[PDB]
């Protein structure tokens, strides 16, 4: 029994669970993409190389902190570490760069502090106190707060750990009662659930950052606090035609984003289940519901989805994660998430590498436990009857791959989409996407199962032989990575002519 | 609005699928189930034999329990004359197989003394005395089976003429038997006799059977329907007689008795296909049990990828009437819904008053039945029970069929020499017709045994560049498709080829628009 | 090893289920599908009519397109004489329903001057009543006096079970000139069918009203209403049956294109449906019948209402003691489709082998019932069942579920109107439903539903209602033992109510047999 072969042959979901075996080793290929946030603990080229070794697929820059040149330097360090392996196209791994926006977030000022259950707290908009915060007065970013808050509303501060109830309202001040204490630091996040904030989804600073990313030639944008389709369209407009290829991933962080989800998903390249803010904005017991709902609909719609925030919190201070954290990652993968994300764990943690290694390990185990019979089956029934060659070839390829127990599905692609279409049907076997486009190579990490492979060889002449060469390139990468051996059987997808959108050929071929 | 039960096939449950079946939903012009017609007095003329091909006959059956070698030699000639009369156009031409159905170990009566009527109660004597072999009446009756008195019993039931006459043995003699008529009816000349629950010792392949098989090999037949097969060793005997000169001739075992049903897995395994011979079976085992046997055998053949023919009395009524009974229409439909590769007419086309109308009716019902097939559940269950194999051809076939459901394709075009590339696509039961393009005339004719395979014979000379030779055969299929109304210009199609010439290199699937 | 296809029903897939079907696995002695026999010259005698009950006839059909009112009045008397001849023993006694099948809006020819028709030779059709008994190869008379208004130059006219076909060449005022398209010999008073032509004959005619009112008086159990085409036609039958016969079940017969199309409309207004294949097979194309049949049986199963598969199930046996392979196959499939009842017409009305025909239906239905994939069936019937807060329904589903679990020999159900039993039936248990009632009419009507064994209690109403219940439960218990449905040690499901009167069933008990 390899990678839960006996588990996947079961008739029922329950019999499948019962047959799950801890002593059944997974395949060396790991399908779920890993996204790491880069900060003080992971910024050095030296450790940044080791994160790629450990399995980081995408690098996140959080734009709610740091200056433009702080990030410009981070990107440089990432590309230095990444291209340090470029001297060997076979073992080399593309690494994407992601810009996560600040967005319409509310922050406190600087502390001059411990708060007590009962003791009152005044909230001012007076900029004279913006660096003089204590147990009596507190300053905020949101200068229009007094228009949307209420006598009796709950205000949450610092990851929703401090809660306050508004007793009295003023013109530019609010009198609150501390409902649960804890200590208050500098520049902390503020939430207002059940209160319709009027801050724009794309602000002035947001426009600056997006235009900056376009120039830094980023791969994707994680747009914070998206609440409707019109907000997604605004991000597109700002990115413009110069960055029209940059992927837009909408972050669902609030009640409205959950509710107008179908509206949003439709207008976006992908979705991130931003659990941090979401866990404050809606009740904490409801998050798993939202998470599973969104991952399912993304799976149904073939668009990428990232499970994010607090997946391994413990590891910010500890070398081993809690049982619940290990359980959380596994389930996120079993839910069908394309990518999983580390934040604090890799930005400011004491154990950034161990945290990444742990994500690889769990995702690989979780991928084996996937009931591929029922999954692929249900994904067919819900797939549309289409007369598009590419789609038909993709379904057929995945189907063939389950039948001949193949080691990989090799796919030649320019824009990435040929590979995207194979991925949405979730084969067991890894999809090796061979492209010459460096950007689509990096972007391919958003999709579950896609192993992007960048070809550096010059364009041969006879297009037939040029194809063959790229196919053999994939073949060598496969052998070297231990995805398959010599005698093994493999699926190869090509097109009848050059250019995007002509994939129509599936071949079953033994390995050289 | 809603073609070939598209709304019916999209249902979640088998019951919801039945409820959504709509009489006003027209089927596709392609009909997948093969039709096999028995040729006799009513269908022997080249002239009417042409019209049977027009109507949809795919295979011609010669029943070798009647007629002389040269009677059949002439029938075959007439068949090939009618078939090649369309050969002047490779696009509209249809290959037609020839089948030899053996006499086998059957028991017959003698001739009625110069129609005798039998009465419930009146006794009847059965003699082996060859002096009475042409002097049969209500008192004496002669038989073929000279070893009958060794396997029959005082109290055994003997059935005569399609099991319509029944007799109980009262006394046993050395060469005679005294019986009591249990239900009457009139007795004719040379009628079939059945002995259920009595182990007959007649050989499966007799001397006459060997003569007929060797004759078929020489007449270059396509398939053998072997009567009264009871075990694997009987199948192996047919192989041996057919020899190396006729090693390509398909062996279809006919299940006609209790033992054949029981050692079925043993038999199917050793045979190229199976025929559910309902006529004799319905006498040999209880009539209420036939449907069980039928459904069991069709399912196991579907599981095993081997062809299966539902046979005998599918449209009896039409021997004398232009319209079939409601039960007969229902029977054909169910046979197809059960998953039968071919359906067969016997008396209906051999000696009937309406041979053509009988064939037209089979086409019509089979086409309607094929639309009503719950393809979601069928294909699905055929995957789960398909073996995990590292054979390129098989993987390409499954993927092709899968792709065809996805892009709603009009056909799956398959280049094949031996037929097997096409066989492997057929066992997964696509909606779309499989157009099998071959140069081998024999595999073209044999391809009719498999559900969904449209054999197409290429007469063009071998082009040079093998690449272009392939392209030409692919375009040949394309033209046949357009002309037959299987697909139009803009339509999407699946094409299966190999990486090099020779059998067993199919590994390439292409999704291609039609010229 | 393996009783009534136990190994076949344990399969994971429909295909694996087919493969595991075994001819050497004997069925249970209980047979669930109801048998309906048409009574005529061959089966009219009290003496043979007793033997039909012995063989398994559950309902008796009277075809009202032939015979006079007193012909039928006599037939009914003979049926009730044969039936009550077993009444001297309540345990072995079997209730037998009486059914009135209407004539309806049918078209007939006149009397022959038999005459032979030839492909090509022309034929004139007259409405002139002077020729109504002078029919030959040149002239032919008809019932439908408004025919010339709905037929066309080029229309096809079918005569005698759709075996003769004619094409209209010229149209007149009261005549039609046709060309014979396929011959055959023409007899007296034969059925005529006009497909694709909208006939304006009323669904319930004057004669139909007379027959319905006659049935009400003869205290019939059900009405098979011919040529129903819309819900308004069903409502007309109700009105005529009135309040004096409001308990008489209305089974609509689907015989034409319009009836198929407005089926949901019809089924919804009717107590049940009959797939009248004879006329339907002429009215719509013969290749399309199986589709219609399977569609209608499925929808009736979904809707919990009875459905009868009818006409030409065993034609061969009108003249032969053994049926054709196709006929044996047809019956089986009709049962496998989920039909509540199967019907013999010519086979028992005018056949040479009425008894052998009934015995054959028993035998096939019993084999077919064993082959039923009960896992998938019951399962799909739950998913499509409505979430209801009705006690009776909940108790029925739970009972059937319990019966699959404890491999029970029966489900015993006390019922007055029959409905408690109807609700258990629609979920299709393996085990036979023994419905114990005192109402003689609901006992006879219970035969319309698959699986229901109606049992009539003749004992006087005991006093303590608790003991009165117990007695009826023990009555069922004795009937079960005597019929060989179960033994002493066996386990059984019992359904009762908390108080007397209809619609209080809410109690399910699992009980060993005395
Ligand atoms: O970007 P897409 O839509 O995946 O297109 C993939 C294309 O790549 C090919 O494999 C060849 O690519 P090139 O044109 O770059 O040589 C085509 O056959 C196919 O149409
Ligand atoms: O059904 P078969 O006998 O395996 O035929 C499949 C063969 O057809 C082909 O497409 C053409 O074969 P030939 O060139 O020998 O005619 C081969 O590539 C492939 O091996
Ligand atoms: O099917 P119905 O007409 O609702 O009959 C069920 C009724 O029969 C009983 O089992 C017996 O009551 P009766 O004595 O009135 O017949 C009741 O408990 C129950 O309400
Ligand atoms: O921004 C995030 O990652 C969040 O809110 O979880
Ligand atoms: O062999 C046959 O076809 C039969 O017995 O019916
Ligand atoms: O009347 C009928 O029963 C029919 O037409 O089938
Ligand atoms: K024969
Ligand atoms: K009638
Ligand atoms: Mg956030
Ligand atoms: Mg035979
Ligand atoms: Mg009728």
Curated annotation (Swiss-Prot), chain C:
The modification S-nitrosocysteine is found at residues 406-407. The modification N6-succinyllysine is found at residues 54, 149, 305, 481. Residues 290-514 are annotated as: Interaction with POU5F1. There is a cross-link at residues 103, 249, 253 (Glycyl lysine isopeptide (Lys-Gly) (interchain with G-Cter in SUMO2)). GO terms for biological process: canonical glycolysis; cellular response to insulin stimulus; glycolytic process; positive regulation of cytoplasmic translation; positive regulation of sprouting angiogenesis; positive regulation of transcription by RNA polymerase II; programmed cell death. There are 4 isozymes of pyruvate kinase in mammals (L, R, M1, M2) encoded by 2 different genes: PKLR and PKM. The L and R isozymes are generated from the PKLR by differential splicing of RNA; the M1 and M2 forms are produced from the PKM gene by differential splicing. L type is major isozyme in the liver, R is found in red cells, M1 is the main form in muscle, heart and brain, and M2 is found in early fetal tissues as well as in most cancer cells. This is Pyruvate kinase PKM. It comes from Homo sapiens.
